[PDB]
Design a binder for this molecule. Structure first.
Ligand SMILES: [Mg+2]
Ligand SMILES: [Mg+2]
Ligand SMILES: [Mg+2]
Ligand SMILES: [Mg+2]
Ligand SMILES: [Mg+2]
Ligand SMILES: [Mg+2]
Ligand SMILES: [Mg+2]
Ligand SMILES: [Mg+2]
Ligand SMILES: [Mg+2]
Ligand SMILES: [Mg+2]
Ligand SMILES: [Mg+2]
Ligand SMILES: [Mg+2]
Ligand SMILES: [Mg+2]
Ligand SMILES: [Mg+2]
Ligand SMILES: [Mg+2]
Ligand SMILES: [Mg+2]
Ligand SMILES: [Mg+2]
Ligand SMILES: [Mg+2]
Ligand SMILES: [Mg+2]
Ligand SMILES: [Mg+2]
Ligand SMILES: [Mg+2]
Ligand SMILES: [Mg+2]
Ligand SMILES: [Mg+2]
Ligand SMILES: [Mg+2]
Ligand SMILES: [Mg+2]
Ligand SMILES: [Mg+2]
Ligand SMILES: [Mg+2]
Ligand SMILES: [Mg+2]
Ligand SMILES: [Mg+2]
Ligand SMILES: [Mg+2]
Ligand SMILES: [Mg+2]
Ligand SMILES: [Mg+2]
Ligand SMILES: [Mg+2]
Ligand SMILES: [Mg+2]
Ligand SMILES: [Mg+2]
Ligand SMILES: [Mg+2]
Ligand SMILES: [Mg+2]
Ligand SMILES: [Mg+2]
Ligand SMILES: [Mg+2]
Ligand SMILES: [Mg+2]
Ligand SMILES: [Mg+2]
Ligand SMILES: [Mg+2]
Ligand SMILES: [Mg+2]
Ligand SMILES: [Mg+2]
Ligand SMILES: [Mg+2]
Ligand SMILES: [Mg+2]
Ligand SMILES: [Mg+2]
Ligand SMILES: [Mg+2]
Ligand SMILES: [Mg+2]
Ligand SMILES: [Mg+2]
Ligand SMILES: [Mg+2]
Ligand SMILES: [Mg+2]
Ligand SMILES: [Mg+2]
Ligand SMILES: [Mg+2]
Lengths: 60, 209, 206
RNA sequence: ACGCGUUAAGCGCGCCGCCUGGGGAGUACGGCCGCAAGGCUGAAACUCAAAGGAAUUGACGGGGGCCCGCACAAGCGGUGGAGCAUGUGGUUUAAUUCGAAGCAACGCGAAGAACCUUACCAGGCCUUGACAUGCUAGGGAACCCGGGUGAAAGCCUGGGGUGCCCCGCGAGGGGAGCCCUAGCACAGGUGCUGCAUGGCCGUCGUCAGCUCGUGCCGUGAGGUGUUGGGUUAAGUCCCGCAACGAGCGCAACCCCCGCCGUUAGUUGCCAGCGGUUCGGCCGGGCACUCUAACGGGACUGCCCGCGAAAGCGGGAGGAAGGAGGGGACGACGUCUGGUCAGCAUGGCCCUUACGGCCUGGGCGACACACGUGCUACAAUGCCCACUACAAAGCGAUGCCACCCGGCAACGGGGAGCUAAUCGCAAAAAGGUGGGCCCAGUUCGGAUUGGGGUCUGCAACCCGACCCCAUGAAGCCGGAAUCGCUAGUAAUCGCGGAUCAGC
RNA sequence: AAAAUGUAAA
RNA sequence: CGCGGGGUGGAGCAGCCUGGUAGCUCGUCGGGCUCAUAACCCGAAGGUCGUCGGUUCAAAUCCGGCCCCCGCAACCA
């Protein structure tokens, strides 16, 4: 369900709604921010590295 | 259906007996008799240490029982004779005392309580019964407790259940399978069947070898 | 476990983005996707040169990647060769454009993500972990730093029991924003398992 | 060591008494004494790897002093009771996938379970494999097409093209290559171990703590500093001190809100004029409102009283005064915490199967128990019609004004906006008007019948919404228990992440 | 005055 | 066998004399407290009264037979 599962979501499936999101880095199915194609974890990681441009920690 | 069942504060059952009725029951529960080790961090753990513990279980098959249909005159030997002590002339000329000998066992009761021989036979026959009963009660105790001493003894046999490894492992046939969960659930068959089979491989090299 | 990433904490405050480019909405994702692909396939090959930081900036199809080192002799290659074929494998995967410009940071000892890797390597090579730590900080402190600290974790020296281990000279005010401090991780792989080196170098105020 | 120290436990001599590991044991036996109770004398087997003295550092106390926290108290609204929403235990099941367990598990991983998602079950399948880089036997070309069967996977097959390296005239060959059939490498696993780990996270705890260097004291563990008086949200500062310094923490540097200024003037704004398609709408113009970018502003600065100081208490001027309100920031470490199921990773294990595919089931089950929740029990209420006043976000595969049909869910038709332009968008409490009259009610809207709209291949298990009818329990909830001290609690809406849809 | 208890593996 | 008493929720014991009416303590079950257990606190379940009969409108209650338990008696020779 690692390398194998992630493959199905990449290729366009039989039906319309059958297609689903998945992290474009860790391949996590659940909780995937569509803006990046990334998961909430991978998002936090790269955002901390600065690799995510213009994105900084919010505070108010 | 459970019978005796002393509790255990938390949790248990510190001891519990149960009549499991049916067909092929003793056949598949035969091999349970013995000590079952358990390794895990107990509920009661004051910190974080894995604790080894054990539990002996004993499967006993259904025993068709039957007490003797009371006594039998044929194996009784009854003697009558003159009672001892006070009574005047009556006590001197009246075989009122009684003595009954129960030939099979060997226990004997005398009785010179009251003046009628008949009534004394009545009492003696009553105590005689009571004395055979408690003889057979003692006998069925020195059999019941003793067959438990027979099965359960100085021997570290039978399966071990390890939780953190998640693996049960019957020591007798040296089979082991890390699917403890299913076992602890009820599906014991891929554990009792391999024993039933290995046991049969022994019965092959029995009277033939 | 509770400490904050020093870098994410100082974005636009004392540290600038490793990638610099606008997007919008309908394109940001696959923009970063290939962007991430770059930095990763860079790191895999340019490891021999030990990169301290890969910068990436984009334009209308035009994409610029200004990589860093402290020993660029590897990147530049024979006479000037390896750098070209590098960029000639670049647009071979971007389907877009190319970029060189590999500037070089002076003291490697004052670059944390550089330091960690050189230390984490010593680990894989089976060296005294207590010693290499104090060696690291020494090399960093005696080369101008105003502070330093290096932390490793895992089965130190193949110990059945894993544990934390560190030393520090000078000062490393991680709580202070005004402090410019370098940081980076390195993954020390070995036969007994995966250790992890974290380097903190306090450069100075601002 | 504690301490003893001319009232030695110092330095010496004389003599008596006594000790030789703990337990057994001041017991047994013997002897002697006693009215007795018991005393004096006084062993052994056995058993343990210690018993023990003083110091040290913590931890703990139903020990103490000083402080502190929504902890008590003073309060206002709730849970616990009801119906339903959901999570969990448990049971059920072919399976009801795995993990989380007092605080710190229980609307937690799940920020989107109808298929997919899916790790489970059943059945139909597949084998160098859906995936990666290679070595090759037949040595075939793309790529579209279709039949066959089928629940789909899968299996099987009819096409056909008449593709490209080679000074090939030539029937024939010669390589690269998506590629096709067979092999060996190898892939693959959400299989096991958080008690082999990295990272990252909860946590005591935004608690004020924790330590190093060196000096000195101590045989030594260790102490000192860090203690002490004052002070503080603070190991915050001041003074003192065999200590003098320093580091990580505290604070500040950052963000948003409060006031003011320069800059900026459309897509925003309108004070005075013109206009006048009955009105920022036309021209018009940055003054304001706003937008967002740089700044000023507060320092116990001034005044009062106490104080050695630090600073405490009160007063003034001020949009704001002693941390202004709020966020970001989580020390050495602690919990054998959590997470091999986000990813990574040592070891272990599966290898035509613990891998992979499909269809259909399950994750939604239901005698019960718990957590968190939503709606209520009504008159400070509820229904109806008119009328208002927000902020922050989303939207060229989307938002949908505007008409048109429909009682409506909505479906046609259609304008504008990639948006300070257009749209989601009616904010709801609120005000005004009208009805209701203390009732299981016009309260309540659970449950069920019947009939439809939408999204999707497809809503039986298993969706959301609309219309009709049904209108349950509940008339303020036992023991118990929770939140919050100011624009807070309570109450009223709206938006978004996820996402076809819910 | 309130108010017992905590087996056995680091 | 001769007389007396007795059998009621799992344990122990009222209620029967006087018919209508099942009670007390403990236990068990569910929910609190506590880190957890017990204590404690809140709520519930649980017997058709040994057994056959008869009386009655109606029987745990009255009447008769049997079973089991308990004490008393069993003497003059
Ligand atoms: Mg599978
Ligand atoms: Mg796709
Ligand atoms: Mg979907
Ligand atoms: Mg017992
Ligand atoms: Mg017993
Ligand atoms: Mg005779
Ligand atoms: Mg004999
Ligand atoms: Mg189960
Ligand atoms: Mg860097
Ligand atoms: Mg003295
Ligand atoms: Mg004296
Ligand atoms: Mg001794
Ligand atoms: Mg002795
Ligand atoms: Mg003595
Ligand atoms: Mg003696
Ligand atoms: Mg004596
Ligand atoms: Mg005495
Ligand atoms: Mg004595
Ligand atoms: Mg204090
Ligand atoms: Mg209170
Ligand atoms: Mg419902
Ligand atoms: Mg089964
Ligand atoms: Mg077909
Ligand atoms: Mg053909
Ligand atoms: Mg504080
Ligand atoms: Mg001392
Ligand atoms: Mg000395
Ligand atoms: Mg200290
Ligand atoms: Mg003092
Ligand atoms: Mg300090
Ligand atoms: Mg604002
Ligand atoms: Mg006017
Ligand atoms: Mg005019
Ligand atoms: Mg300023
Ligand atoms: Mg003031
Ligand atoms: Mg003050
Ligand atoms: Mg520890
Ligand atoms: Mg509701
Ligand atoms: Mg209309
Ligand atoms: Mg209409
Ligand atoms: Mg349309
Ligand atoms: Mg336009
Ligand atoms: Mg109103
Ligand atoms: Mg309904
Ligand atoms: Mg009422
Ligand atoms: Mg006890
Ligand atoms: Mg305990
Ligand atoms: Mg009783
Ligand atoms: Mg308790
Ligand atoms: Mg019941
Ligand atoms: Mg019953
Ligand atoms: Mg009767
Ligand atoms: Mg009757
Ligand atoms: Mg009669």
């Amino acid at each position: 369900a690692r390398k194998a599962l992630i493959e199905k979501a990449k290729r366009t499936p039989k039906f319309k709604v059958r297609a689903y999101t998945r992290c474009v880095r860790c391949g996590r199915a659940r909780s995937v921010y569509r803006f990046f194609g990334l998961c909430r974890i991978c998002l936090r990681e790269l955002a901390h590295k600065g690799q995510l441009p213009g994105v900084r920690k919010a505070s108010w | 259906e459970i019978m005796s069942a002393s509790e255990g504060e938390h949790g248990g059952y510190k001891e519990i007996i149960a009549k499991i009725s049916g067909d092929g029951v003793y056949g598949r529960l035969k091999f349970e008799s013995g000590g079952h080790r358990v390794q895990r961090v107990p509920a009661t753990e004051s910190q974080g240490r894995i604790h080894t513990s054990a539990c002996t279980v004993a499967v006993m098959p259904e025993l068709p029982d039957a007490e003797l249909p009371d006594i039998n005159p044929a194996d009784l030997r009854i003697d009558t004779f003159r009672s001892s002590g006070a009574g005047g002339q009556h006590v001197n000329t009246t075989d009122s005392a009684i003595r009954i000998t129960h030939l099979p066992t060997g226990i004997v009761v005398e009785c010179q309580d009251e003046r009628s021989q008949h009534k004394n036979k009545a009492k003696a026959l009553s105590v005689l019964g009571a004395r055979i009963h408690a003889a057979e009660m003692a006998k069925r105790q020195q059999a019941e407790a003793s067959t438990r001493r027979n099965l359960l003894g100085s021997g570290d046999r039978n399966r071990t259940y390890n939780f953190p490894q998640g693996r049960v492992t019957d020591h007798r046939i040296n089979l082991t399978l890390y699917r403890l969960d299913e076992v602890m659930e009820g599906k014991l068959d891929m554990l009792i069947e391999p024993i039933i089979q290995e046991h049969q491989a022994d019965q092959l090299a029995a009277l033939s070898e | 476990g509770n400490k904050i990433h020093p870098i994410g904490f100082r974005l636009g405050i004392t540290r600038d983005w490793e990638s610099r480019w606008y997007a919008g909405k309908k394109q940001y994702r696959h923009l970063l996707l290939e962007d991430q692909r770059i930095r990763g396939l860079l790191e895999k090959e340019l490891y021999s040169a030990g990169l301290a930081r890969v910068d990436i900036e984009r334009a209308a199809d035009n994409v610029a990647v200004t990589v860093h080192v402290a020993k660029p002799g590897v990147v530049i290659g024979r006479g000037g060769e390896r750098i070209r074929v590098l960029r000639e494998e670049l647009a071979k995967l971007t389907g877009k454009n190319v970029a060189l410009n590999v500037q070089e940071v002076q003291n490697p000892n004052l670059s944390a993500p550089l330091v960690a890797q050189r230390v984490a390597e010593q680990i894989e090579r089976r060296f005294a972990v207590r010693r290499a730590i104090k060696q690291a900080v020494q090399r960093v402190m005696e080369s101008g730093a105003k502070g330093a600290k290096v932390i490793v974790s895992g089965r130190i020296g193949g110990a059945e029991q894993a544990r934390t281990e560190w030393a520090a000279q000078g000062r490393v005010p991680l709580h202070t924003l005004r402090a410019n401090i370098d940081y980076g991780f390195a993954l020390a792989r070995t036969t007994y398992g995966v250790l992890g080196v974290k380097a903190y170098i306090f450069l100075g105020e601002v």
